[PDB]
Amino acid sequence: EGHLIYHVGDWLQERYEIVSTLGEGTFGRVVQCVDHRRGGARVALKIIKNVEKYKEAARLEINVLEKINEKDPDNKNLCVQMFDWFDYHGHMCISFELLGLSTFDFLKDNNYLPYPIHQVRHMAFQLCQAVKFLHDNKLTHTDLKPENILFVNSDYELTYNLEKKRDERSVKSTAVRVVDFGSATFDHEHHSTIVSTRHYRAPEVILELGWSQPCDVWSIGCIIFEYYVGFTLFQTHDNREHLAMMERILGPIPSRMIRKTRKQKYFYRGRLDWDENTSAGRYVRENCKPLRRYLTSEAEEHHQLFDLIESMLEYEPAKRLTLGEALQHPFFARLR
């Protein structure tokens, strides 16, 4: 498949002693290494497949990662640090700071039982800070999701949930980092027509009306919801169904966006061409509901969170909350 074959103990660059495999994917593999040129510091080495397209994609990430480091010498940006990069016999290798499991991995290991609201607040704040940094530097991440947000340390402690009568895993530290900048696009760069993983895709991306920074905010909205409930907001792999789910959860699509889109097969009489009476329409009715019906409590802090999610899930990209605004939200008031 083009993967680099390696054994526990191998030395790349005569520098990186392989300890274990941290991750795996279609990009390649991530390996924990002892960096003998950095005092024996444990690093995370992303080894990209020996494949033309993935190599060219890795170089674009390296370009973003170099801009990330440049514009953040003190490492306050909450984006993953690249310490080194090199070309190893066709394999692009990137040396990262060692982190923990993804916020998805942790949620999954916790039976998809949601994060506590106080942890959601700290996770959401850091997410907004990290992407705002990118937004300030003329960048859009495009591929934001629980998998691309990692805990710095994913060590947990067992905590009883008196309500659900179950034991829950609670991460000791909620410090997170944003990873995977392979899709990151500069303002001047060639924008792809379709971006984001399905579940976190903004409606302007679906309707192909052009996209920039606002589409990241839409993703962050979905992610934060997922942190609060446990399951993904839009569970679908179909455009027309996705748009129907959007309408049920958030209300009608703005008339201007229907008017402007070329995706006119999805629309009839200036409204969404969706029949709720079908078995597909009934499925949408029984698998999702208006956004605020997902509240686990009526306490003020829970309502403030959904004020934030709702503002982030504004249909119109230009009318959508910016991340500079997001950090000023009443929901983040009780943080140091």
Ligand X SMILES: CCN1/C(=C/C(C)=O)Sc2ccc(OC)cc21
d(CA 242, CA 244): 5
Instruction: Specify whether the CB–CB gap between 57 and 92 falls below 8 A.
Output: no
How does DSSP classify residue 194? S
Instruction: Specify whether the CB–CB gap between 83 and 161 falls below 8 A.
Output: no
User: Has 143 been annotated as catalytic?
Assistant: yes
Ramachandran assignment for 284, one of left (phi > 0), alpha (psi -120 to 50 degrees), beta (any other) = alpha
Contact pattern from residue 115 through residue 154 relative to ligand X, giving x for each residue in contact according to CB under 6 A and a dash for the rest: -----------------------------------x----
Q: Which one of 92-100, 156-164, 277-285, 312-320 is the stretch in contact with ligand X (CB under 6 A)?
A: 92-100
Q: Does 22 bind ligand X (CB under 6 A)?
A: yes
Q: Does 30 bind ligand X (CB under 6 A)?
A: yes
Among 23, 114, 146, 317, the residue binding ligand X under the rule CB under 6 A is: 23
221 annotated ligand-binding residue: no
Contact pattern from residue 171 through residue 200 relative to ligand X, giving x for each residue in contact according to CB under 6 A and a dash for the rest: --------xx--------------------
Subset of residues 43 to 62 that bind ligand X, contact rule: CB under 6 A: 44, 46
| Dihedral sign (CA 192, 204, 222, 309) | positive
Residues 241, 142, 234: CA angle, nearest 5 degrees: 25
Residues 226, 232, 233: CA angle, nearest 5 degrees: 90
Q: Which one of 23-31, 164-172, 228-236, 314-322 is the stretch in contact with ligand X (CB under 6 A)?
A: 23-31
- Closest separation in Å from C-beta 119 to ligand X: 20
Q: Does 204 bind ligand X (CB under 6 A)?
A: no
Among 99, 120, 309, 323, the residue binding ligand X under the rule CB under 6 A is: 99
d(CA 199, CA 188): 26
Smaller CB separation from ligand X, 146 or 317: 146
- Closest separation in Å from C-beta 273 to ligand X: 37
d(CA 220, CA 258): 24
Total binding residues for ligand X by CB under 6 A? 13
d(CA 285, CA 267): 19
Name the 3-class secondary structure at 299: coil
Among 4, 80, 195, 309, the residue binding ligand X under the rule CB under 6 A is: 80
Question: Looking up tokens 């097969």, which residue turns up?
Answer: 265
Active site residues per annotation: 143
Q: Which residues bind ligand X (CB under 6 A)?
A: 22-23, 27, 30, 44, 46, 80, 96, 98-99, 150, 179-180
